[PDB]
Amino acid sequence: NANRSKEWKNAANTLLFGLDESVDPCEDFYGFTCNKFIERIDLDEGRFTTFSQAQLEVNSDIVKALEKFSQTERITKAAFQSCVEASVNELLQYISERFELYREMGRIEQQRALPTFMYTWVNVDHKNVSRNSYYISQPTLPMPRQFAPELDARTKAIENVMKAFASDILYDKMIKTAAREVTQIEQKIAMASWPDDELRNHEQQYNPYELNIRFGKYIAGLMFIGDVIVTNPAYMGFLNTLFQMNQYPFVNYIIVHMLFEDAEHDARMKCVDTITTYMPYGTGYVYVNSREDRDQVVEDVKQQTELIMKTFLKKGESYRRAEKKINEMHRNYGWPKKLDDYYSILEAYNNKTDTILNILRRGYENRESFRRKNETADRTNFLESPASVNAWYAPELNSLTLPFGILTSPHYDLQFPKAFNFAGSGTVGGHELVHGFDDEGVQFDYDGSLADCSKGKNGFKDMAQCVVTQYNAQCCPAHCANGAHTQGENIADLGGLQASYNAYKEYIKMKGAEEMRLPGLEKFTPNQIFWISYGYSWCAKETQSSLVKRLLTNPHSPNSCRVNQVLQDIPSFAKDFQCALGQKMYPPAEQRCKVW
Amino acid sequence: NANRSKEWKNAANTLLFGLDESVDPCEDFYGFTCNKFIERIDTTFSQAQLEVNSDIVKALEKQTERITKAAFQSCVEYVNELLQYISERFGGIPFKGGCELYREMGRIEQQRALPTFMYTWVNVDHKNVSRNSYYISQPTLPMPREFYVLPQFAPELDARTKAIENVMKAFASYDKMIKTAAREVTQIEQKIAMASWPDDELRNHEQQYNPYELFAPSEGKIRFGKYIAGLVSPVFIGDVIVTNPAYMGFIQMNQYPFVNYIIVHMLFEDAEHLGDKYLRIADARMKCVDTITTYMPYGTGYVYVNSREDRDQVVEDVKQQTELIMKTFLKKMLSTLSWMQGESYRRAEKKINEMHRNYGWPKKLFDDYYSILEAYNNKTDKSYTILNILRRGYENRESFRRKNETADRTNFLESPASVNAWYAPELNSLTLPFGILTSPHYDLQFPKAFNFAGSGTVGGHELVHGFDDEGVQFDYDGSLADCSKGKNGFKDMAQCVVTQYNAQCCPACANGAHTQGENIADLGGLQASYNAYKEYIKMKGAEEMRLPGLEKFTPNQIFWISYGYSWCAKETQSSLVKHSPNSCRVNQVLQDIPSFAKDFQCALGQKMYPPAEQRCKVW
Amino acid sequence: NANRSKEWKNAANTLLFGLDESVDPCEDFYGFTCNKFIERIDLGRFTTFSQAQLEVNSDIVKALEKVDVSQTERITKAAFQSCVEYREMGRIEQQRALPTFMYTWVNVDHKNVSRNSYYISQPTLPMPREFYVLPQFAPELDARTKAIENVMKAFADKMIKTAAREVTQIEQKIAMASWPDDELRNHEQQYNPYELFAPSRFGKYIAGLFIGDVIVTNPAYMGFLNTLFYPFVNYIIVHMLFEDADARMKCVDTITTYMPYGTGYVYVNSRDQVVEDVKQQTELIMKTFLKKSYRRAEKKINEMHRNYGWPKKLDDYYSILEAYNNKTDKTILNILRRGYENRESFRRKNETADRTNFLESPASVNAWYAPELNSLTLPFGILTSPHYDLQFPKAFNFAGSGTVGGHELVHGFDDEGVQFDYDGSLAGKNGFKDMAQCVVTQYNAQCCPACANGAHTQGENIADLGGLQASYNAYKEYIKMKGAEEMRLPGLEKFTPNQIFWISYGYSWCAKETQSSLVKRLLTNPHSPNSCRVNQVLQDIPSFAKDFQCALGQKMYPPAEQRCKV
Known part of the structure; x- marks a missing residue:
């Protein structure tokens, strides 16, 4: 049996690419759901996640819509259109403009979004939740x-950067010391x-310091302050032990770093992507107000996610406390509610024009999210663009979002069996949901304060x-994995799934049978297809070397290791x-580690 | 098949108390060689230590002579006020100009040997050695x-509250403080x-190496x-090293938290002298002599060696024995090895070649006083609180009078009665203790499979280090040149x-990435000691002579059996969860x-x- | 509890060399047994036999070089030096021993064991x-024209193409x-004789080379050939030519197949213990094989013409005369000695049939057996390295000589062996x-x-199964007499005697071959393909x-x- 309807054929066409029925599904799994994909797709000239697949799809559709009364959308459109592409001079100008070292460092960070030696940008505090607060924290390093x-590869590349720089003269060895x-x-x-x-x-990592x-x-250099909080007394x-000669080798570093940033300075993606990174609400506002369709997304999730939560939560004092938490969670779907136009422009009102274009953005994003300090604290925002694909949960706001972006690629589509969507969107959502109860989230509480949500600990x-x-x-x-640094998000998905699966089950127990074998691989119930889907999402093969590379550095595990x-x-x-x-x-x- | 001797029967007797033939041989090798020793006891090393100790006791049963005597006689036989003045040399927990927390420290170190805010051992420089130096460094956490x-x-937390409840039994009568603190x-x-x-x-x-002098820290x-x-005109200027420039x-509420912690600690491991009450929170001769055995090291040593055996004899044996090992180990060279290279070979080879022995006694220790010069200063007065405190005062004070004289390369790290070699790649040295020239690790008239699995093994078991990813660092003579690419x-x-x-x-684990190093030596040493025993025995071709207590076994197998008998150690399980864990090492x-x-x-x-x-053929 | 007699250590090295512990000893038995011997060796086909055969040929070159003072020897020597560098068809066969259009050779008639009837069989191609x-x-299909034109132009024009x-x-x-x-x-x-007046x-x-009845194995x-029949001459040239496209070997080998007597007499006499050592082994198997109608074959065996070693008609007088029809003087030799070998076997026709004949040189290794007369033949060469040398663990000499003996012996009871009686004749089975x-x-x-079939070779297949399956029982018996020779070989203390016995037996067979020759081998022999064999x-x-x-x-x-039996 099969709902012959075309879109269902379309859903089966996306499930066929990577079906690999040759290998028994009871023996191994990850093979039986991606091995095709690994195979057909030669490694695009690293890691090519189905996510980044989506990323291409959406970001393209973005581009497609862009080209075309219209203010910010116009801003972007111009910005992007300036992409088809020397100007090292400009940079040199920046350095010269610089060359009280600190305030320098400050303004560099500021107008170039390049974080070094103090990676700082603010949010609500934890311990007193309305009071915005700075932060200061160990940087993030290549x-x-x-x-x-x-290490020595890092070396070689460093010297080679400043070398390629040494093209311009406006001392051919000392670099080999610097x-x-x-x-x-x-x-x-x-x-x-x-x-x-x-x-x-x-x-x-909370000890506060005000006015070592x-x-x-x-x-x-970033622009009676509150108590700057410093997350690493260590x-x-x-730094304090690491400080007129100093200036020479210390500034030596901040340059080479800042330089190394943008060496490179259909490929259209590349820059469009960057734009989404930096003017995020802008491109978002594009994407939604260029795809405009709400019903299929203002509900299905806002049907799904509600189902999911309620189920999972319901599967002593804790159970309640936690409940009140989830029941409380602010839950922002598709995209926020600053979206007619003006006010979109109005927050985003800091740009205009006829690497300069890139430099105007870098400093605009460093201020954009850090300009809330002057205003009152909020629980209602995003972390990032509603145009990425992810789902994040900053417990510091107890905020669960779902960027409208993902909901099109194989994590959601409107006209598909409830299976697919309960394995795509449904999953990553329920993943999130729990992701605030592992030992990251559990330390917080329905506001974002801290005693301990949790003994059952x-x-x-x-x-x-x-x-x-x-x-x-x-x-x-391809040689093994880490522990804790992996449980970090493992435990999440390990739970979130079971949540979503129960959700599917009870759902379909709320609507009779509906189990319409799916019309290109007709030989299953839905259920099998539900697995097959969740399997699918993570279908990705990766560079054998980059495999171990991102084996360590990735918080959360290799694809296969997970899915299977x-x-x-x-x-x-x-x-x-x-x-x-x-x-x-x-x-x-x-x-089995019955997680719940 | 075998010979009828009194000595071999003893070596055959010991064999029979370990084994089990019942369990499969290859299915969990650990249990195949140590089942019994497990089944009864409630371990091997600790065994040998008990032995050598009780030996030292019979010895002491009668001037290092008298010093260690008095020592023990104290440690068996024996409230708060005095050391209270010590505590009241700061001010205490409950209810100030900004004190040099160190001065407090330095005092407390040199007076108790109680490392906080720095473990600071002091010796041969790493990379300009003709001299000595300080290694001021982080603590080693309780x-x-x-x-x-x-x-x-x-x-x-709570091994703390209670063990700090002394006060309202010491001098007071206010818990909330005490808890929070x-x-x-x-x-x-x-x-x-x-x-x-x-x-x-x-x-x-x-x-690590970072030479600084108070100029630079200031x-x-x-x-x-x-x-x-806190530590005899000093050499403050002499190259000091802040190993961890982290x-x-x-x-108010932050400064004195230190002095708390510090005092927490001091009293926390001097409750013994306190009233019989708090000692609770923790054999007689065993514990005692051991305290000595890391405090006035050479004393008990000299007692042992120049007391109970003919130095010449065992020393002259072990000389050539080790030499065999070290040799064939050298033979495990480039010619043998894989990850190495020609000149990297020649060098590391030489590192061996110029490398030192030391057995039992120091080169000193046998005009017979001169040892009683080494341990000279240690006042004797039975005319124990003061006693111990004094003796520690020495152990380290001795360690540092060593500072300002000139660097040797025959350093005897520790008291020649601990049953373990050591090899201090800081300088270069291979000292082995008489206290090992003994049971299962060794004996004079036992099958050689053993005297390579025992003394033999441990000899190699350690010697490896000078090629680990630690040994590579220090050269032949002791310096930094990254001896060897091959890496x-x-x-x-x-x-x-x-x-x-x-x-x-x-x-029911024991994650590997952490213990890598010593793990590698597990292999290296044993690998050698085998390859030697092979060589030796081939030179004769007769020793085989199966054992009286049991024909069944081979002149060869028993080698592995013995080695994997050394580590027969019924680690009780609490102790297991609290080097690597043995059963692993064997298997x-x-x-x-x-x-x-x-x-x-x-x-x-x-x-x-x-x-x-x-086989991870790394040797 | 092992042994350390140095003679066993020498034999140990050989077996251990090819043996592999990486793989388990049950799954792909053949694999585990000699995976080494595959992965060690350089690069046609090459295998344990070819191994020994080499060894012995080296040895014979050696002794050849050593003594250079019987004239027979002298011949083979000079040869070796020299090598280091209707009527129509018949006439050629005579002069060349290169066959076409009919293969022809002579031996005891099958009707009666007295007259030497002429067998004319269909011929074997390259x-x-x-x-x-x-x-x-x-x-x-062209390689023919290829090799022709090669030497053709050297002779020197396109007749080649058609031809x-x-x-x-x-x-x-x-x-x-x-x-x-x-x-x-x-x-x-096949047997259906005709006279000298029947050909019409x-x-x-x-x-070209008789009044006697002549036998045509193939009447179809x-x-x-009568319906077939001038240009054919070309063809024969081709073949004749086609005969002729370290040389130490290929030389001495040619010798082997052509001076199939001197070689043996110059190797075996360059010896009373060896013959006596295998004498018991041969008598051990036979009887054990027996112990299991019954009477006839019983006799047959008890009358089979055993022959250890090498001929007995090998002082010098005989060896001289038997080959005296030679004269070879100072590589036209190739011809000369091709015309002497085929004539020496054809000259026997005139003489009455015998029971002692020797079907091939006592130089190389395969215990050939003629049901024709009735005879095992274990040429002295074989009883050697790793089949059997004078002092190895009885494990081997059974797994070696004992084997290839038994594998041979049993031929008298396969597909063919049945239809012959000890005479050399015919008649619930x-x-x-x-x-x-x-x-x-x-x-x-x-x-x-690498195909994947073998319905022709049940002949040698069953010959194996039996021969060995018996032999092993024989050894079991042998040791049941004593119970101590179990001293296990040094350098390998994880197998018991019986284990060894097998291990050896397997090893006797290993080989590493190019796939091409493998698939050709498959359909060009009376053999399993070795791996199939062992397993x-x-x-x-x-x-x-x-x-x-x-x-x-x-x-x-x-x-x-x-498992079916015999």
């Missing part, structure tokens, strides 16, 4: 890390900065421990593909 | 491992561990000078070891010497031996 | 018999005329015939590794599966449908 010489200078500078920064996993004691020694105003001290750690075991004993093909682990931890699925016990996808033996 | 990051498994003396602790260097980073000494920070008086740079090869190969330990759990490093897998008769494809990627 | 004619393979396609065509028309080997498996039919210049043909191919289907079927359920014949012997106790399910132990 390599993420001992063993490696990849190099080693900035390198071992990396090394110091890192070797005192904080590695990741330990970035969870929000209890800790060696400081210059330096806030000026770090923001370690025991049972919590009981989950986490065993899961890390399972992982560091279920190693991806998370499943292994579901009795339900175990049924759905009427398999036999004592197989490669059954933890009778290496027991 | 709570074993920086575990101030990943689970909230800190009840030292207990939580605090933690919360600082965290604020430390999150700034030391977890061992992983503490490989490449090349970046320029670097806020007190060092004023500190160093000092997090730092108020890439080396690290990659190591990653085999890494995964190996990482996928085979003992309890794993047994895998990787396929030579074994064969020579133990058992089919391959078995969970003691892996296929084609047979 | 390429395989039934490889040409199938809606199939397109091989080399080729023509001669090839004559071939193609000759091949499908032949008989496949699928049914050269029945002597009831065959009289003349032979007169012989009758087709159906029961056995059943087994045939069984093996060839079960066997055919297995394949080769399969061991799929059958129970005692093997036992000693390895490879439990059920593992793909070498399906006793459920058991």
Whole structure:
């Protein structure tokens, strides 16, 4: 049986590309859902996630709509149209304009969005939730890390940047020292900065400081302040021990860094993408007000997500407390409510014109999100563009969003079986939902304050421990994974799925049968198709080297390791593909970590 | 088949108390060689220590002579006010101009040997050695491992409140303070561990080394000078090293949190002298003599050696024995090895070639006083509180009178009665203790399979270090030149070891990436000591002579049996969860010497031996 | 508990060299056994036999060089030096030993063991018999014109072009005329003698080389030759020519196949313990094989003309005279010695039939057996490195000599061996015939590794199965007499004797071959393709599966449908 309807053929056409029925689905899985995709798609001339697939699709559609009474949309359109493309001179001008070192550093950061030595931009505090507050924190640095010489690759590239610079004359060796200078500078920064996993004691990284020694105003260079909060007593001290000669090798670094930024300065994507990064609400406002369709998205999710939450939440005091939390969560779908036009322009009212174009944006994004300080604190915004594809949950606002963007690629479509959408949007949403109850979110509370949402914290750690075991004993093909730094978002999806699956189940228990075998691979119920979908989303192959590269640095695990682990931890699925016990996808033996 | 001797029967008797033939040989090798020793006891090293100790006791049963005597006689036999004045040398917890926290420290170190805000050992420079120097460095935390990051498994909170409830029993009668301050003396602790260097980073000494003199710290920070008086005209100017130039740079409610923590600690491990009450929160001769055994090191040593055996004899044996090992180990060279290279070879080879021995006694220790010169100063007065405190005062004060004289290369790190070698790649040295010239590690008239699995093994087990990714650093003579490129090869190969330990759990694990180093030596040493025993025995071709207690076994197998008998250690389980964990060391490093897998008769494809990627051949 | 007798250490190195521990000893038994010997060696086909055969030929060059003072030897020597650098067809055959249009040789008549009847069989081509004619393979078809024109121009003009396609065509028309080997498996039919007046210049043909009854093995191919019939001469040239496209080997080998006597006498006498050592081994198997109608073959064996070693008609007098028809003086030799070898075997026709003949040089290695007269033949060369040298663990000498003996012996009881009686003549046995289907079927359920078939070779297949399966029992007995020789070989202390025995046996067979020659080999021999051989014949012997106790399910132990026997 099959709802022959075309769109359903379209949904089956997207599910066929990567079906790989040759391999048994009860033996392994990730093969049976992406191996095609790995195969057909030769590596586009790294990692090519179905996400970035989407990214191309949407960002294109953006471009398509752009080209065409209209204010900001016009701003962008101009900005982009300036993309089809020397001007090093301009940069040189910037440096010259600079060359009280701090305030310099300040303004550099400011008008070039380049963060160095203090990666700072504000939000609500935690401990007193209306009062905006600054922050100061260990920077974020190109390599993420001992063993490696990849260090020396960083070296080679550094010297080669400043070399290619040395084209312009407006001393052909000393660079071969300045190099080693900035390198071992990396090394110091890192070797005192904080590695990741330990970035969870929000209890800790909160100590406040207002008005340690060696400081210059330096806030000026960003534009009675509140208490600047400093998230690494360790770090923001370690600068103080690292300070008239200093200027020579210390400024040496900030240049080479800032330079290294934009070396490079149908490809149209490249720059359009960047635009979405920096003028985000702008391009967003494009995307929605260029796709305009609300019904299919102001509801389905706002039907789905509500279903999901309610289910999961409902599957002592805690249960309630947490409930009140979720029930409370501010939940922003598609996109915010500043969108007729004017006011869109009005927040976005800081640009106009006939690397300069890029420089006008860099400093406009560093101020845009940091201009709320002067105004009252809010719980109602985004973190990023409603034109990316992601879903994020800044518990500091207890805000769950879904950028309208994703809801078109295989995470959502309107006219598709409730299966697909309960595995796409439904998943990543329920993923989010829980993602605020693991040991990141759990430390917060329905406002964003802190005592502890949670003792059952025991049972919590009981989950986490065993899961890390399972992982560091279920190693991806290409050499293994990390623990905690992976559970970080694993535990999330591991739960969120079960949520979404229950949701599907109860839903379809609320609407009779409806199970319409899907019209290109007609041989399943929906359920199997639901799995097949969630499987699908993460279908991506990656550069064998970049595999391990992004094995470490990625917070959350390789694709395969996920998709064919998370499943292994579901009795339900175990049924759905009427398999036999004592197989490669059954933890009778290496027991499932029943997360909930 | 075998000979009828009194000595061999003893070596055959010991064999019979470990084993089990019942369990399969290749199915969990650990249990196959140590089942019994597990089954009864409630371990091996601790065993040998008990032995050598009780020996020292019978010895002491009668001037180092008298010093250690008096020492023990004290430690068996024996409130608060005095040390209270010590505590009241600051001011205490409940209810001030800004004190040089260090001056407090330096005092407390030199007076108790109680490292806080710095463990500071002092010796041969790393990279200009003709001299000595200071290694001012982070502490070594009371709570074993920086575990101030990943689970909230800190009840030292409450091992703290109680163990600090002394006061309202000391001099007082107000808990809320006491609690919050207990939580605090933690919360600082965290604020430390999150700034030391977890061992992983503490490989490449090349970046530890940072020579500074109070000039430069004064320029670097806020007190060092004023500190160093805590430690005899000094050499303040002499190259000092702040190994970890990460000092997090730092108020009422924050300053005195220190003095709390510090005092927390002092009293926390001097409750013994306090009234019999609080000692609660923690054998007689064992504990005692051990306290000595790390305090007046050479004393007990001299007692042992020049007391109970003919120096010449065992020393002259072990000389050539070790020499055999070290030799064939050299033979494990470029010619043998893979990740290496010609000149990298020649060098590291030479590093061996110019490398030193030392056995039992120092070169001194046997006109017989001169040792009683080394340990000279240690006043004797039975005319214990003052006693211990004094003796520590010495152990370290001795450590530092060493500072200002000139650097040697025959350093005897530790008291020649601890059953372990050591090899201080700072300088270069290979000292082995008489206290090991003994049972299962060794004996005079036992099968050689043993005297290579015991003294033999440990000899190699350590010697390896001087080629680990730590040994590479220090040259032949002790310096930094990155002796060997080959490295890439080396690290990659190591990653085999890494995964190996990482996928085979003992309890119910023991993540590998952390313990890499010592793990590699597990292999290296044993690999050699075998290859030697092979060589030696081939030179004769007769020793085989199966053992009386059991014909069944081979002149070869028993080698592995003995080695994997050393680590027979019934680690009780609490202790297991609180080097690597033994059962691992045996099983794993047994895998990787396929030579074994064969020579133990058992089919391959078995969970003691892996296929084609047979062995992380890193030696 | 092993042994350390140095003689065993030498034999140990050989077996261990090819043996691989990486793979398990049950799954792909053949694989585990000699995966090494595959992966060690350089680069036609090359295999353990070719290995030994080499070794011994090296040795014979050696001794050849050493003593250079019987004239026979002297001949072979000078030869070796020199090498380091109707009527129509008959006449050529005579002068060349290169066959066409009819292969011809002589031996005891099959009717009676007295007169030496003339066998005229269809001939064997350089390429395989039934490889040409199938809606199939397109091989080399020009290589003929290729090699012709090569030496052609050197002789020096395009007649070549036609002449080729023509001669090839004559071939193609000759091949499908032949008989496949699928049914050269029945002597009831080939034997149908004619006289010297029945041919209707065959009289003349032979007169190229008789009044006796003449025998035509193939009357369908012989009758087709009459319908066939000038340019044919080209063809023969081709072949004659086509004969002729470290040389140490190829030289001494040519010698082997052509001075098939001197070589043996110059190697075996450059010895009383060896013959006596194998004398018992040969008498051990035979009887054990026996112990299992019955009376006839019982006799046959008890009357089979055993012959160890090498001929007994090998002072010098005989060796001189037997080959005295030589005279070779100072590579026209190639001709000279081709015309002496084929004439030496054709001259026997006049003489009465014997029971002692020696069918080939005692130089190379395969225990050939003539059901024709009745004779094993284990030429001295074989009993050597890794089949059997004088002092190895009885494990081997059984797995070596004992084997190839037994594999030979049993021939008297296969597809053919049945239809001969110890005389050398003819006449519930159906029961056995059943087994045939069984093996060839079960066997055919297995394949080769590159095709994937083997319904012709049940001859040698069963010859193996039996010969070994018996031999092993024989060794078992032998040691049941004593119970100590179990001293396990040094440098390998994880197999028991019986294990070894197998391990050896396997190793006897290994080989690493180019795929092309593999597929050709498949359809050009009476052999399984070795891997199929080892694996399969061991799929059958129970005692093997036992000693390895490879439990059920593992793909070498399906006793459920058991293993047919003989």
